[PDB]
Amino acid sequence: GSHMRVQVSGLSDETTWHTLKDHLRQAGEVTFCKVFSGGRAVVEFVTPEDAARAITELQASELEGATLFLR
């Protein structure tokens, strides 16, 4: 499922998983969304297309005042 997986960095201190999930629903359906230390998270989407759309169209987007980096 690596093709469906996106690594997120740059989250604000206050941002939790469901908020990130809602942000990324702009790109597609989210099947895994967990927040980790240092403003980071790992997300998986239903399809590789959704992951591609997130990286393509949501790169450096602001969430709760913080710019996200996607890879």
Author numbering: 199 to 269
Q: Which statements did the authors publish about this structure?
A:
However, TbRGG2 does not contain the signature aromatic residues within its predicted RRM RNA binding motifs, raising the possibility that it may not adopt a canonical RRM fold. To address this question we determined crystal structures of the domain, which encompasses residues 203 to 269, from the T. brucei protein. Two apo RRM structures were obtained, one of the RRM(L209M) mutant, which was constructed to aid in crystallographic phasing and one of the WT RRM. Both structures were solved to 1.8 Å to final Rwork/Rfree values of 15.1%/18.7% and 16.5%/19.7%, respectively. The WT RRM structure contains four subunits in the crystallographic asymmetric unit (ASU) and the RRM(L209M) structure contains one. The RRM molecules in the two structures are essentially identical; the Cα atoms of the RRM in both structures can be superimposed with root mean square deviations (rmsds) of 0.4–0.6 Å. The structure shows that the TbRGG2 RRM indeed harbors the characteristic RRM fold composed of a five-stranded anti-parallel β-sheet surrounded by two α-helices (36–37). The TbRGG2 RRM structures revealed no interfaces significant enough to provide stable oligomerization, suggesting the domain itself does not oligomerize. Although the TbRGG2 RRM adopts an RRM fold, as noted it does not contain the conserved aromatic residues located on the RNP motifs, characteristic of canonical RRM proteins. Instead it harbors valine, arginine and glutamine residues in these positions.
